[PDB]
Write a protein that binds this DNA or RNA. Sequence first.
DNA 1: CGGCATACG
DNA 2: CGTAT
DNA 3: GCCG
Length: 325
Amino acid sequence: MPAYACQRPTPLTHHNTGLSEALEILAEAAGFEGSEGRLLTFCRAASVLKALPSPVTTLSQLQGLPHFGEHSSRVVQELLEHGVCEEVERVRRSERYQTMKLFTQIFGVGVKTADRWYREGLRTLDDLREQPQKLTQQQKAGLQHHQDLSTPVLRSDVDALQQVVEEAVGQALPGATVTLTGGFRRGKLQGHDVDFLITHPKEGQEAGLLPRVMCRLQDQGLILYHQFERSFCIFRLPQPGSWKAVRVDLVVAPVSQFPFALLGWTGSKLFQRELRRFSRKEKGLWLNSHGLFDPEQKTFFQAASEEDIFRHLGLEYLPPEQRNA
DNA sequence: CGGCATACG
DNA sequence: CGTAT
DNA sequence: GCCG
Ligand SMILES: [Mn+2]
Ligand SMILES: [Mn+2]
Ligand SMILES: [Mn+2]
Ligand SMILES: [Mn+2]
Ligand SMILES: [Mn+2]
Ligand SMILES: [Mn+2]
Ligand SMILES: [Mn+2]
Ligand code: NA
């Protein structure tokens, strides 16, 4: 079992769902308390279990697995023996965890804002609605649309959105292309939002594209909210006899950077963090969604494909469906 | 012990 | 500060 | 919280 998640296939569905979900509760709770290191360890331990070929049934099966020490092993031990982990259940039931989860799941509210509101005594969405003068426009939109945005987006919804985005992109710049990324590209059947990557085969023609796309979407009446190369929108998605608000992310990259942007925006989040960590710490190369930089030669790697990037890093290629770390 | 990914709006 | 994978 |  390799130590980095980018060194191992991780499928979307696996054989240790309950164990990984418990560890991810502790990771989330660590994040609400600002402990990014503990969050990462719990996330990595969770992902190791997702990568195993069969269920963990006995504690000895953890011996030698990376990222399982005293704490994560005890969590698993309790789940194996009693079906529940007291720490995990204590977190689940806590007022702090529930409220931080509720607040941070609002579009426009991060851990720092949620925590401040929590310390001020606020607990519910109606508590936030009562004093809208304290809210940003982004948070007002997140709060107004919160119910719709908590409803899973279905792959059937995605095809519809892709069609309307392509229509606007085709008018903004003939020849430009739209690629579905994010969790749906990794094979998820449901998601919290839809992620699209836009480019054009002639380097430089994509310059200025996103404002032109946004203006055309807004003119078709499809944009309930938007704030460049990244656009975090709320779309109006037609529904049977009505519609619902859906979060959509639109990203533009020049074709030279497209493989890096595709790789980054396809995720998972943990997979990309681990991949960038591996790149820097094991290979001495600096990776982001624009490129891969050798700081010794002071040069950027040219990539024509995700396969190129994996090869550059000395990693076996992983299709998106196996990047579900 | 230090590090923990790395961007853009 | 928020957002993204 | 865990690794190197
Ligand atoms: Mn502990
Ligand atoms: Mn016991
Ligand atoms: Mn997404
Ligand atoms: Mn997104
Ligand atoms: Mn850029
Ligand atoms: Mn330390
Ligand atoms: Mn996400
Ligand atoms: Na949020």
